[PDB]
Design a protein around this motif. Structure first.
Motif, PDB file in Angstrom:
ATOM      1  N   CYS A 187      -6.968  37.328  17.825  1.00 18.92           N
ATOM      2  CA  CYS A 187      -7.839  36.817  18.570  1.00 18.92           C
ATOM      3  C   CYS A 187      -6.842  36.251  19.809  1.00 18.92           C
ATOM      4  CB  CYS A 187      -8.623  35.614  18.032  1.00 18.92           C
ATOM      5  SG  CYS A 187      -7.418  34.157  17.242  1.00 18.92           S
ATOM      6  N   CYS A 191      -2.071  32.412  12.390  1.00 17.44           N
ATOM      7  CA  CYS A 191      -2.991  31.795  13.512  1.00 17.44           C
ATOM      8  C   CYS A 191      -3.783  30.938  12.910  1.00 17.44           C
ATOM      9  CB  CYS A 191      -3.861  32.962  13.699  1.00 17.44           C
ATOM     10  SG  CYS A 191      -5.103  32.486  15.190  1.00 17.44           S
ATOM     11  N   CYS A 204      -2.164  34.176  20.262  1.00 22.52           N
ATOM     12  CA  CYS A 204      -2.281  34.984  18.925  1.00 22.52           C
ATOM     13  C   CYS A 204      -2.396  36.508  19.286  1.00 22.52           C
ATOM     14  CB  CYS A 204      -3.849  34.677  18.224  1.00 22.52           C
ATOM     15  SG  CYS A 204      -3.876  35.539  16.577  1.00 22.52           S
ATOM     16  N   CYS A 241      -7.564  32.690  12.950  1.00 21.22           N
ATOM     17  CA  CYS A 241      -7.824  33.792  12.499  1.00 21.22           C
ATOM     18  C   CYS A 241      -7.038  34.036  11.166  1.00 21.22           C
ATOM     19  CB  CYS A 241      -7.776  35.076  13.404  1.00 21.22           C
ATOM     20  SG  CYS A 241      -6.098  35.750  13.755  1.00 21.22           S
TER      21      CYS A 241
HETATM   22 ZN   LIG Z   1      -5.906  34.478  15.790  1.00 21.71          ZN
END
Ligand SMILES: [Zn+2]
Ligand SMILES: [Zn+2]
Lengths: 232, 64, 50, 113, 144, 386
Positions: free
Chosen positions: D59, D11, D54, D14
């Motif tokens: 997230c 990601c 994601c 994140c």
């Molecule tokens: Zn993420």
């Protein structure tokens, strides 16, 4: 009574609105791991004066009642969360995990004192005394996500499940209006229709979003409220 | 050959794209900065640069 | 100016690149004066003579 | 090339894996690829390449579509992707996550590239 | 009421006929004459029906619009208030939103719309300023 | 009305109240071309309009054809309906004409004898209005999106120029200097606007999503960067989540409006840059070039008129309330300008029309005993169900 009214031809609070919308949230769908999220758009469906709504929301932020988080699926996508739900759910998720102490530090120090949607590395390092490894612990916990080098959004752990369901539900419910006859649908008929399997968050929650986001126009009729696609 | 062109009206480089609507034998060139658009008949030999040349010629023909 | 600093970082990237590999496909050869190409670390390691 | 491949596997925000390590389809990799880190990366990559969100935890944020041109990287929205901030996101990948990329962090953390 | 309007406008616009049924159109005219509210809903129905991705539905709804525009000031006001979208829907002035298939019905729609709009320009354009502007826009800037 | 007239005659209300009330009522009554056409001279879209500040009689127009047209707005005919005629034009036959689209025209703020023009041919030109000959010409490396002259500065005569280059430029018409650059922005500068309150304060907006306020006297760099969240001076502040393409100070200079391609309009305190949190909803703004919009003056409410696709949206500035959509043009509106004296709005669009929006509060009144000389009930207004 006899002059000032001639000058030109032209009451629910944000706190009430947030508290009502918060009950539409299906807590069991996430095993209550998510704190209930209300979008800022939905608040405008119950408080039509957007300026008054925004100012009352800013005042709830300053009392510390609510958190505003950027959800990133759209430019205006702000989630409104009660601080006590957020704090409880995050501490419950951190219990005995390796990032736990930095998260306890974050919830004891930054969030009581800051309203910001985002933090810069200058503040994090010098004002709150975070080590660079503790920012890594916060990103692993999901309480921050990288915005840019040395900057982070405040985040909610597990927001991806909600955001997935919300984005697909929104397109589903908007297509229910788009596909119905005349592109019209009466709100009572829609709310009475068996929601698509795609609409996992519930159908009322989405109509409040769609109305607040101005993605659909309400029209009042003798038959009741009517949804339309806007001339746009 | 180049398939993106400088707009004759707004002088922005690589601002015009060509849409080859072969099924209707018509070609549309549109500027993304000023949304000036021009339509010309196209053949199967015709290519983006022929549509752009037709547009520049129509502009110089209008200056007369 | 941002385009000058972009071009300068691009040139730094090109030189750090041609230090390791001076046989890039889509870029000019790094050269000495009189125009001979520089031997990179890759060309030192690569072939039968490497 | 490794930089490009790892960016397509985490990601962009994140720095968690873009697929769930707990999913049977990844526990298959972690069983069938022990001691074979390049094989791990190849099988994680060919799972991740089709993702765009994601959620997979996670997230909710969407992901870019990075393309190389010479020594430049373009991130699709056409942003030329800076090596800084690529450093930042790599810096936040967990040692457990980069282990599943087949990059034993004791010796080759991705930001060192 | 509203259900009768709904059924009339369906049976007129799903008909696929080259011309309107005169009796059902008489009923639709009677409804429109009977109530400004129902005429307003008829307009809002027809403009939506003119969005249909099928040229015969557009042709039918346009024929209904043509029949009503000659007959009420309020309907003329409504149609002219959105004439930009109406012309996008009926001449295809936006190349991102072209007329749907079939071509054989699209040529009928395009010709009938051109003839109608030129007639409305002569009969009403001096009163409805936006109609005269629309006609000039067609004639000179889209080069119709 | 009669209440206002009585209260004014008796001195119960300050004459201000009737005047501001009736000015507000007139803005609420704007109707398309009700009494008035504007002569179609342009063949291209109308990029820019500017009404002369001294008398408000004359309007300059610039277009995508590169033509500059000068119009007379006064009805020197004796009819109730008239055409705003073109007095003169800098057409394609003129030697000094611009080669590419003209993106801003502005009168000299202090008298009508000079005006300025800029264009995507990378020039700023200074014109002698009596002769339509250029007096001075400035050349740039990059296409000019915007220029402004300070409406209140008597001390200096500086033109700010925004270009595709990242640096704002300042041309001094007195000295002929054009070397001075401001170096804070990172992408094309789409709108520049001098404060109407302060001689030296210049707002600048860019595709980098930043609005910066400058004091052009200083060697220090900019003063303030607008942060839409209100929390930090430069490192990350943005006014919009998109390109910022239009600026307009409120008529008192105490606030700055901004519009951007995030489809939001935002109101800012000009003395410190605080976002005032007024929310107008969606304001449609796809424009990849500068957008010119205007506030009212002299009304009881301050209105803002903003291009909204092909419509002009009217808002109350402080309340955020949308008042009306003026629904005339057939293509995206690029500018509008407000005639403060009579509350008449002019609008330019890519449909090549200039449209006048004029207060239409009530009709000429008949005498019922007339045969045919009445205020005619034209049959176009009649139903015909037979
Ligand atoms: Zn993420
Ligand atoms: Zn152009």
């Amino acid at each position: 009574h006899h002059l000032i009214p001639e000058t030109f031809g032209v009451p629910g609070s944000a706190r009430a609105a947030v508290s009502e919308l918060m009950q539409l949230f299906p807590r069991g769908l996430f095993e209550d791991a998510l704190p209930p999220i209300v979008l800022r758009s939905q608040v405008y469906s119950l408080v039509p004066d957007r300026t008054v709504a925004d100012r009352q929301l800013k005042e709830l932020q300053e009392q510390g009642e609510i958190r505003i988080v950027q959800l990133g699926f759209d430019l205006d996508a702000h989630g409104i969360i009660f601080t006590e739900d957020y704090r409880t759910r995050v501490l419950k998720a951190c219990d005995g995990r390796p990032y736990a102490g930095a998260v306890q530090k974050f919830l004891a120090s930054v969030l009581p004192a800051c309203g910001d949607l985002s933090f810069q590395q200058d503040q994090m390092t010098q004002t709150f005394g975070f080590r660079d490894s503790e920012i890594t612990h916060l990103v692993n916990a999901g309480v921050l996500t990288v915005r840019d080098a040395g900057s982070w959004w405040l985040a909610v752990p597990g927001a991806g499940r909600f955001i997935k369901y919300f984005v697909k539900g929104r397109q589903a419910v908007l297509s229910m209006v788009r596909k119905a006859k005349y592109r019209e649908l009466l709100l009572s008929e829609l709310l009475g229709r068996r929601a698509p399997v795609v609409v996992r968050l519930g159908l009322t929650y989405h109509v409040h979003d769609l109305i607040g986001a101005q993605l659909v126009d309400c029209i009042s009729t003798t038959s009741g409220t009517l949804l339309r696609l806007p001339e746009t | 050959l180049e398939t993106q062109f400088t707009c004759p009206f707004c002088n922005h480089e690589k601002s015009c794209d060509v849409k080859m609507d072969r099924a209707r034998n018509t070609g549309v060139i549109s500027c993304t900065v000023c949304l000036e658009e021009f339509q010309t008949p196209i053949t199967y030999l015709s290519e983006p640069v022929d549509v752009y040349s037709d547009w520049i010629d129509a502009c110089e023909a209008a200056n007369q | 100016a941002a385009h000058v600093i972009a071009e300068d970082v691009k040139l730094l990237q090109f030189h750090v690149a041609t230090m390791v590999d001076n046989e890039l496909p889509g870029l000019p050869r790094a050269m000495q004066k009189s125009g001979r190409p520089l031997k990179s670390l890759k060309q030192r390691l690569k072939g039968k003579e490497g | 090339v490794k930089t490009m491949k790892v960016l397509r596997c985490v990601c962009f925000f994140c720095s968690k894996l873009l697929v769930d390590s707990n999913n049977p389809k990844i526990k298959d990799i972690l069983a069938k690829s022990k001691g074979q880190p390049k094989k791990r990366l190849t099988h994680v990559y060919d799972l991740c390449k089709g993702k765009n969100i994601c959620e997979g935890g996670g997230c909710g944020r969407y992901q870019p579509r990075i393309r190389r041109s010479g020594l430049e990287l373009y991130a699709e929205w056409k942003i030329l992707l800076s090596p800084e901030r690529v450093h930042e996101i790599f810096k936040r990948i967990s040692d457990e996550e980069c282990f599943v990329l087949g990059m034993e962090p004791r010796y080759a953390r991705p930001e060192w590239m | 009421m509203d259900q009768k309007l709904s059924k009339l406008v369906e049976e007129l616009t799903t008909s696929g006929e080259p011309r309107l049924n005169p009796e059902k159109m008489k009923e639709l005219k009677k409804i429109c004459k009977s109530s400004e509210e129902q005429l307003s809903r008829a307009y809002r129905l027809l403009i939506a029906q003119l969005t249909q991705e099928h040229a015969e539905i557009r042709l039918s709804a346009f024929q209904i619009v043509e029949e009503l525009f000659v007959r009420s000031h309020q309907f003329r006001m409504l149609v002219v208030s959105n004439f930009q979208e109406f012309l996008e829907l009926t001449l295809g002035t936006d190349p991102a939103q072209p007329l749907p298939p079939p071509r054989e019905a699209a040529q009928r729609l395009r010709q009938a719309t051109t003839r109608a709009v030129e007639g409305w320009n002569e009969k009403f354009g001096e009163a409805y300023k936006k109609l005269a502007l629309g006609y000039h826009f067609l004639r000179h800037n889209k080069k119709v | 009305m009669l209440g206002f007239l009585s209260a004014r005659q008796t001195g119960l209300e300050d004459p201000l109240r009737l005047r501001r009330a009736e000015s507000t009522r007139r803005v609420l009554g704007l109707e398309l071309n009700k009494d008035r056409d504007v002569e179609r001279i342009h063949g291209g879209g109308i990029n820019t309009l500017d009404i002369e500040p001294v008398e408000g009689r004359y309007m300059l127009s610039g277009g995508s054809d590169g033509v500059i047209v000068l119009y007379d707005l006064e009805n020197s005919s004796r009819q109730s309906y008239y055409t705003c005629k073109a007095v003169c034009s800098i057409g394609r036959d003129h030697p000094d004409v611009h080669r590419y689209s003209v993106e801003t025209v502005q009168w000299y703020p202090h008298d009508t004898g000079m005006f300025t023009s800029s264009s995507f041919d990378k020039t700023l030109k200074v014109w002698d209005t009596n002769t339509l000959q250029t007096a001075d010409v400035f050349n740039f490396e990059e296409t000019v999106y915007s220029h402004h002259m300070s409406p209140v500065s008597t001390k200096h005569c500086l033109v700010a120029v925004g270009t595709r280059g990242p640096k704002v430029q300042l041309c001094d018409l007195k000295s002929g200097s054009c070397s001075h650059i401001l170096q804070g922005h990172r992408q094309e500068i789409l709108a520049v606007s001098w404060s109407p309150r302060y001689d030296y304060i210049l707002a600048t907006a860019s595709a980098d999503s930043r609005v910066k306020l400058w004091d052009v006297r200083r060697a220090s760099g900019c003063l303030i960067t607008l942060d839409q969240h209100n929390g930090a001076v430069e490192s990350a502040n943005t006014a919009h989540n998109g390109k910022v393409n239009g600026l307009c100070f409120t008529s008192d200079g105490l606030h700055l409006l901004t519009v951007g391609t995030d489809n939001r309009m935002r109101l800012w305190n000009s003395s410190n840059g605080e976002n005032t949190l007024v929310n107008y909803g969606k304001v449609c703004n796809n424009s990849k070039k500068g957008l010119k919009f205007t506030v009212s003056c002299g009304c009881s409410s301050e209105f803002v008129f903003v291009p909204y696709g092909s419509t002009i949206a009217v808002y109350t500035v402080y309340s955020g309330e949308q008042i009306t959509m003026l629904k005339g043009h057939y293509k995206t509106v690029d500018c509008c300008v407000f005639q403060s004296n009579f509350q008449e709005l002019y609008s330019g669009s890519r449909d090549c029309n200039i449209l006048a929006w004029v207060p239409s509060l009530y009709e000429p009144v008949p005498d019922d005993d007339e045969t045919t000389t009445k205020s005619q009930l034209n049959p176009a207004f009649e139903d015909a169900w037979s």
